[PDB]
Symmetry: D2
Subunit: 414 residues, 4 copies
Amino acid sequence: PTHDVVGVGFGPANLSLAVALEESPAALTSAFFERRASISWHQGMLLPAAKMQVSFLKDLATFRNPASRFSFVSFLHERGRLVRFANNHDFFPTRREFHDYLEWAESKLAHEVSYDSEVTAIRPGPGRPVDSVLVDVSTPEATRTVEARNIVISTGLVPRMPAGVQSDEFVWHSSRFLDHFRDRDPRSLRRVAVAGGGQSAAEIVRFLHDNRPDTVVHAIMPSYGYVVADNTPFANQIFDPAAVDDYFDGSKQAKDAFWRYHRNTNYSVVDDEVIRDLYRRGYDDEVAGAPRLNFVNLAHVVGAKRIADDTRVTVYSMAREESYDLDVDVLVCATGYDPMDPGDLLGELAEHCVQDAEGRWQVDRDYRMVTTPDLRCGIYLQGGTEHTHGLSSSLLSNLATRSGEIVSSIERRK
Amino acid sequence: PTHDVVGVGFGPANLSLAVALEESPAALTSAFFERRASISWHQGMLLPAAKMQVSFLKDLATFRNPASRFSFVSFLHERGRLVRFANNHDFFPTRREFHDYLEWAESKLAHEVSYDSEVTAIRPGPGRPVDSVLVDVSTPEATRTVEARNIVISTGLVPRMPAGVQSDEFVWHSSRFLDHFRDRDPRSLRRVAVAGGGQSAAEIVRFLHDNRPDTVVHAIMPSYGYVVADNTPFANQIFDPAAVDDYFDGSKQAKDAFWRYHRNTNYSVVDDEVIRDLYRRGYDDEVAGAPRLNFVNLAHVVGAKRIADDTRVTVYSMAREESYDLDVDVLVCATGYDPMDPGDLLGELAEHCVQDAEGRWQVDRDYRMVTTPDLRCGIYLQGGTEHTHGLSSSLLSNLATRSGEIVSSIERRK
Amino acid sequence: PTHDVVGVGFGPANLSLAVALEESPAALTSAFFERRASISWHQGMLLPAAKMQVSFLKDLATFRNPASRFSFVSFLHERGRLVRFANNHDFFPTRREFHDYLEWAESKLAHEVSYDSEVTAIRPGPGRPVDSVLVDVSTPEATRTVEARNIVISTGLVPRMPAGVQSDEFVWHSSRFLDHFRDRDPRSLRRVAVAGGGQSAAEIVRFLHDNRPDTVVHAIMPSYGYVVADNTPFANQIFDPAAVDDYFDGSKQAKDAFWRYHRNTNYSVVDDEVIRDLYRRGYDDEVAGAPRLNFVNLAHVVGAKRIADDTRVTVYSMAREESYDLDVDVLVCATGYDPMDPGDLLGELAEHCVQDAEGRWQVDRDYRMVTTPDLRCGIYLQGGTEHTHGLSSSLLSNLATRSGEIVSSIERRKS
Amino acid sequence: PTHDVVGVGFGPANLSLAVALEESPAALTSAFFERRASISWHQGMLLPAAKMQVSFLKDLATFRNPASRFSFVSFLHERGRLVRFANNHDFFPTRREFHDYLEWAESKLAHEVSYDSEVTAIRPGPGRPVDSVLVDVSTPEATRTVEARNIVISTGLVPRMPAGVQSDEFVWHSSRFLDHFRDRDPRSLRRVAVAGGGQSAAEIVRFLHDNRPDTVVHAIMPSYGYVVADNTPFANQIFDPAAVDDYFDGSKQAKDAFWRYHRNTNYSVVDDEVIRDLYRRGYDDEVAGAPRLNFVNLAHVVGAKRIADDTRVTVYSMAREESYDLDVDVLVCATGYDPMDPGDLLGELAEHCVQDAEGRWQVDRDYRMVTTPDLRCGIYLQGGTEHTHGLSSSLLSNLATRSGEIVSSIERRK
Ligand SMILES: Cc1cc2c(cc1C)N(C[C@H](O)[C@H](O)[C@H](O)COP(=O)(O)OP(=O)(O)OC[C@H]1O[C@@H](n3cnc4c(N)ncnc43)[C@H](O)[C@@H]1O)c1[nH]c(=O)[nH]c(=O)c1N2
Ligand SMILES: Cc1cc2c(cc1C)N(C[C@H](O)[C@H](O)[C@H](O)COP(=O)(O)OP(=O)(O)OC[C@H]1O[C@@H](n3cnc4c(N)ncnc43)[C@H](O)[C@@H]1O)c1[nH]c(=O)[nH]c(=O)c1N2
Ligand SMILES: Cc1cc2c(cc1C)N(C[C@H](O)[C@H](O)[C@H](O)COP(=O)(O)OP(=O)(O)OC[C@H]1O[C@@H](n3cnc4c(N)ncnc43)[C@H](O)[C@@H]1O)c1[nH]c(=O)[nH]c(=O)c1N2
Ligand SMILES: Cc1cc2c(cc1C)N(C[C@H](O)[C@H](O)[C@H](O)COP(=O)(O)OP(=O)(O)OC[C@H]1O[C@@H](n3cnc4c(N)ncnc43)[C@H](O)[C@@H]1O)c1[nH]c(=O)[nH]c(=O)c1N2
Ligand SMILES: NC(=O)c1ccc[n+]([C@@H]2O[C@H](COP(=O)([O-])OP(=O)(O)OC[C@H]3O[C@@H](n4cnc5c(N)ncnc54)[C@H](OP(=O)(O)O)[C@@H]3O)[C@@H](O)[C@H]2O)c1
Ligand SMILES: NC(=O)c1ccc[n+]([C@@H]2O[C@H](COP(=O)([O-])OP(=O)(O)OC[C@H]3O[C@@H](n4cnc5c(N)ncnc54)[C@H](OP(=O)(O)O)[C@@H]3O)[C@@H](O)[C@H]2O)c1
Ligand SMILES: NC(=O)c1ccc[n+]([C@@H]2O[C@H](COP(=O)([O-])OP(=O)(O)OC[C@H]3O[C@@H](n4cnc5c(N)ncnc54)[C@H](OP(=O)(O)O)[C@@H]3O)[C@@H](O)[C@H]2O)c1
Ligand SMILES: [Br-]
Ligand SMILES: [Br-]
Ligand SMILES: [Br-]
Ligand SMILES: [Br-]
Ligand SMILES: [Br-]
Ligand SMILES: [Br-]
Ligand SMILES: [Br-]
Ligand SMILES: [Br-]
Ligand SMILES: [Br-]
Ligand SMILES: [Br-]
Ligand SMILES: [Br-]
Ligand SMILES: [Br-]
Ligand SMILES: [Br-]
Ligand SMILES: [Br-]
Ligand SMILES: [Br-]
Ligand SMILES: [Br-]
Ligand SMILES: [Br-]
Ligand SMILES: [Br-]
Ligand SMILES: [Br-]
Ligand SMILES: [Br-]
Ligand SMILES: [Br-]
Ligand SMILES: [Br-]
Ligand SMILES: [Br-]
Ligand SMILES: [Br-]
Ligand SMILES: [Br-]
Ligand SMILES: [Br-]
Ligand SMILES: [Br-]
Ligand SMILES: [Br-]
Ligand SMILES: [Br-]
Ligand SMILES: [Br-]
Ligand SMILES: [Br-]
């Protein structure tokens, strides 16, 4: 049995794809595979006060269909919270609530996702021309293979550690913060270093300050202070559906300009309110004569070693041009992520995929990889399109339209 | 041809009723009569910067049906302004845009509304007990009559002038502000008095200040300064549909408590931002050495007379306990409105309508007037229920649910 | 040794006064008596996040002297926090910081305040007409009497419990919340009722929510929800120095209008940010499926009794018009305060103080009590002037000007 | 008569110097020369709604002396506007008010500034080593020379036009906008192009939009939309006096990091409120069906020519890598400024001043130019220290401390 489309991974991107498929009048068969036991949307960073970075209007479907049964508003309504929510006058739900929104949408779906199912490889199906791919799925029981005309790869961002630093028992990447943190002894983390100057770093430092009154925190970052995230209406336009076209059709020079001027809409920056809350906390501690937040500015973490009961963090100071050591209990690296890269999954097929001069994957406007003529199957990317489609690639800004264009593309070809 | 329901007036309340009728699976016949040529939603006060006092989520239908084709979001989408709107991160549309929303919703409707049609009386149909009512409609050419099993009266708020003051060519009620203003010679309104301390008074003063750089304005109000409108999330819960119950089922003592603590949510109060804008304007004028805004606090307007080229306003000062005259070109009375009273329209029918101890109409929870067995046809009120249903009666807070409850009620009895 | 002026109590008002005395070129002798061991400014309510309700510009002196050594700005500078503070862009200091500001100002003063000194009575001095008063001061060791040509009474607001409810081991007035709370065992305050819909009530409920995540709280108040405090610029003008004139010279009618329209600038109301924080808290608990905040609206606490291990709170519901019992661990009554009353302290001198029709003290514009000719000794009130001077009387809005006007009055009358 | 110190220019920087001199117990003689007839602080850009970018606490003296007779608070008090101002709860005065503050401070000063006096050169005084400088001052009547042991150069930012574009009758630099705007006839500026994406460009566009209702405006800028200014509390720390030290003592690596991460605090960025107001204006025009603001993003102005009665602006589009002509009435170039150059008055003395490797003036922390032993007189810079002291140089953030440090330095060496 050969499916019209198979989705690899089940985060928000393929969820919105599933929703788009259901709402389309086109009769398309599909299967989705998620390695984890259920939807798990950055649970390691589901901190108490964490808030979405996208407006509730930017949900699974609303921008494409303003009367979707899968809209965030529909979800508030069935939960009996729409009125309460509207009273609050906040365009930004909590991460906690949005996570519930995802699970609610998944349940509503007619079709069933296959959990505990890791896709291990994608191989060319039989014959010429190649009209199908073979998808190798590993369950905890048994391995198997499914066949599909089209495949949609949406496996998410990949944690990135500082060069020369490896994750270990007392060294964590931010993505795994709560998983480690909930599993400690509550008074065996009196000294924590957090590396990074982005949203993750800021939220973790905030949480630590708010959690235990006696934790001392070292916030280590290359800038002189947190840099504000730009979420003013015009800059935010780069996430408009039409701005995808502008980036896509634009020259390399124009693409560079988007990054030069507007990377501060998302990368290595912190939300205004979180910055102000941290600043207020620092100020009040100073007034109380009990400083706890140590901001190590203009600096990078360059190494970590466990020495007896201490995690020894090597810090490079850009001001002094020298390195030194800080001793803590745990090092949290909030040092960001690498883009989704379909390559590692593609091993058979990658040689049917065209690269550009700088060796990156060519991708069509409709998120479809560029292939050899012998490949006729569709390979679509949700994620990993930073270089072709722009800053919206890893974000929640454009779920409805992106998923819709992919579904239309697939239909247009069947 | 006897209609299931006839709507008198076509403002937002009956519009939402029309929408509720179309979305209901119940097959109900209806007709709507509006005395004006088209939807005309306080156009006299459609000032340049005027904002809705209610969230865009509080539209014609969303609270009842979160995926209505008549939602504000659907409107934005069809106009191609949903993305732009979301980027603004403002819950409050402009009055101008909301007016366009109403006209858009009216056009989408399958039913056609009858314009230029004034309802002049409502009479008992032929029968005992009465199973229908007759509805007299006057058009420019003819007069006719319509028979209905239910009526819904939604005529509006009635302009109220100060005691002992009659409107005039030089003495305007705020409701007609732009009708008189528009084409009045600019060089002829150098001195304007505005009576009142509410949202209407504040917006008019602001507009005058913004629009002619030489007008001198006297803002006359009983308070020592504008009182802020309470729109904090808890107080705003009095407009929750569950709060309608809470008022309705509550004792007279409880009802009085709503008004004594929370009338500040709507009556005789001014929006925070409008207050601050006025204050900023006054401050800057002082800095510039050119005061323009004269605030006559602890005061009321008690009379007006035209004397040669001057409108002479008699002001009573509470502080001094005396009266004095103030000469201006025009007096604008932003002195508020009276609730909608169905009584005039009913005439003949009033007698089968039950009153309470204090002489007020009794109304069931579903907005249906209490009648004597002599009457079995339904008379519903959208407006004029301040005493029975509470502060939401004249407002836009609860359109979707009240219209829905009325439609359900009519279907239930049929 | 007869002093020109004696101050009873040493809160911000009398501190203000001490500052005004020092800055005045007039050579006036003065003594201040405070019952407590040191300045103690509503310490029972010094909660972690508590913020001033008045701008830092409304400090001890700035409105009268823009370049005072006692300004809040000066304080920030000396503490090396002025630059940091400026960057925060908030006009409202924390209560904790403001408390440090007061202590700092007191230390800088050339005068020394007598602490642990309770004023127990004020008596007519010798002779007629009375040219001085005698101030009875009780210390832990001894008792003594001092003599003064003028006296300034500034003893502060007085806690007010609900009628028919008495403070106790398990029934606290908000003013003493942290006093009691810091003593009790955490696992023993699982159930708390808080009565009131004002700033105190709201702050206490937020603190409980934020500081113990398994505490259940019942917020009992007469309104349908918290009412917002009006702090918009025009309404705030009622606290302007000139508005004190406007209230004072105005008829009863106009005085009543101030209260009818603008009592919501201060009484029985809650700051916008605190309301939204509480609302956010409730919302997030509902999402998590773990409700903890129970808002009991349109209601009054009418009684409390201890029954075994439970504090039984009798609540009257206005909606239903019945009463019922609610069991908790502690009842906190955030039910407000009564105005300062110079009455009790005055005793005999009250005979020489003139009352109005409704039996209240007559007070001149300069805060001096109206007296018969048999008394020429100045009695000034900082507090307790709500009926003559208006809503600024118990607040921090007008410290600089009021203190300055009292000092000027005293000096104008010395000669 | 040899002065201890001579100030060239009398803007806020030297004004704070004059104040610092008067408050210092040191008896130092001084003279100040200003080319203009009076204090003239960017009057070309004194637009109606223009706000300070710096807090009122950052005034001429307060950070140094919290109880200065020259504080902004003292100013408000004398003008009887301290109470009113505090009620507003806005840290940012208007530019108009601040200008009045300057003039007020200048009048209070005991010292008398010499206006209409343009410094044309600074030359070494007699014999070696030079112990004084000679300052050539040109008045409308005559030219004279004064002698001084120290000199403070504070001549301000220098307007910078685009490469290939010259100011003219219909091509204006933003600095002269009001001077130019005012003579013109309203009916003659129906089409205006404004180049730039910074605070100047944004304010000018907003003013045009607000001041005429028919003007069509082309906003031409290299970014995809306005970039928000970073004004969050850690970011404002860059301007702390203690941060001057951090920048000064830091390596060249560290210095680069300040600019890389935090130039957005000031350069090529727009205040949050101004951005939202422009966005609101664009939105309402679209609703009204009358678009007037044309945002020409990802673009540069590269030439201008007058052709009959139009100004032909050549625009380069990065997106299309192409240029085209845009015809208008006036081109306003809001393309920024070039930092103060100590060097152009310096002439011969420049031989005795030390450059570094990249050819830049060496400057001591106390703002004094590094000289050979042949020069012993002090040359101080307020402005032109971007390289050595950082982003605070042209700004108002640090007037009190900078002026105080310079006064102390001069006293110390005397
Ligand atoms: C803490 C935090 C918070 C946010 C964000 C990031 C982070 C780190 N983001 C960005 C983030 O990229 C976005 O929110 C989504 O996670 C993107 O959804 P995806 O479907 O692309 O992948 P997603 O990252 O959700 O995961 C895809 C799934 O594929 C699975 N998978 C991987 N390999 C597989 C295999 N071989 N076989 C089967 N399954 C496999 C993974 O297990 C995973 O569940 C964000 N952006 C924004 O615009 N607004 C926001 O609020 C946030 N919030
Ligand atoms: C300037 C201004 C602005 C606002 C508001 C009021 C005012 C004065 N309001 C309140 C206002 O009542 C509400 O917005 C609606 O107008 C109420 O709808 P009805 O449909 O109930 O009245 P209206 O909307 O007043 O409906 C009445 C209609 O009936 C017609 N009519 C009257 N008599 C008739 C007859 N005999 N025969 C036929 N037709 C007849 C009238 O022509 C009119 O069109 C408000 N509230 C809120 O919550 N948010 C807001 O933003 C605003 N905005
Ligand atoms: C929790 C809280 C918080 C605030 C406020 C109230 C409360 C309850 N207030 C109002 C308050 O009234 C004001 O801040 C000061 O307390 C008033 O100064 P007095 O100096 O008038 O009172 P207090 O400040 O009450 O001064 C009275 C002193 O006299 C002493 N005393 C009493 N009897 C004595 C005796 N017989 N002998 C000697 N000493 C005696 C007392 O011990 C006390 O120290 C306020 N207002 C505002 O405008 N902004 C704000 O931010 C706040 N904050
Ligand atoms: C529209 C606008 C608005 C602002 C700002 C810039 C602009 C363009 N700035 C930055 C600006 O640099 C600052 O406000 C001051 O103008 C700097 O003072 P100087 O005293 O340093 O320059 P400034 O230009 O003010 O003074 C220079 C003076 O020297 C005179 N002069 C030059 N050469 C001379 C000679 N040879 N002989 C005699 N006189 C001579 C000039 O005539 C001029 O009066 C700012 N920054 C900030 O932090 N917050 C803010 O709000 C603003 N606002
Ligand atoms: N509440 C939410 O919804 C939420 C929460 C967290 C994250 N997110 C999202 O997750 C995505 C990624 O955010 P992120 O914060 O996790 O990463 P970033 O990629 O946004 O964070 C990286 C930061 O660490 C710094 N860094 C790199 N190497 C370092 C080193 N050796 N030592 C110290 N610091 C170092 C970076 O500096 P430089 O880049 O300058 O070199 C940068 O400041 C974003 O889209 C973000 O919005 C969302
Ligand atoms: N951060 C700060 O600076 C801070 C903090 C706390 C307080 N304060 C100040 O101190 C002053 C007083 O504030 P406050 O909140 O302490 O007291 P408050 O303003 O007088 O409020 C008292 C409240 O209790 C209610 N109440 C009275 N009896 C009740 C009963 N039997 N049951 C339930 N509720 C009852 C009152 O309702 P009704 O009046 O409607 O009947 C009112 O809501 C104010 O000036 C205030 O701003 C300042
Ligand atoms: N209210 C106030 O107090 C106020 C008002 C105005 C200005 N200021 C201050 O004055 C200083 C300068 O502000 P500013 O806006 O005038 O200067 P600016 O910050 O340098 O802004 C210059 C802008 O023009 C752009 N640009 C340069 N060449 C261009 C070209 N050929 N075509 C199109 N665009 C071009 C720049 O782009 P790129 O940088 O990307 O190259 C930049 O966006 C700041 O300190 C500022 O805050 C204050
Ligand atoms: Br948290
Ligand atoms: Br968004
Ligand atoms: Br709901
Ligand atoms: Br890890
Ligand atoms: Br483009
Ligand atoms: Br689509
Ligand atoms: Br609302
Ligand atoms: Br759209
Ligand atoms: Br009228
Ligand atoms: Br307007
Ligand atoms: Br008048
Ligand atoms: Br009269
Ligand atoms: Br209802
Ligand atoms: Br319903
Ligand atoms: Br707290
Ligand atoms: Br205030
Ligand atoms: Br400081
Ligand atoms: Br107690
Ligand atoms: Br008055
Ligand atoms: Br005074
Ligand atoms: Br000279
Ligand atoms: Br600032
Ligand atoms: Br003043
Ligand atoms: Br030209
Ligand atoms: Br020019
Ligand atoms: Br303007
Ligand atoms: Br550093
Ligand atoms: Br740079
Ligand atoms: Br163009
Ligand atoms: Br400095
Ligand atoms: Br200094």
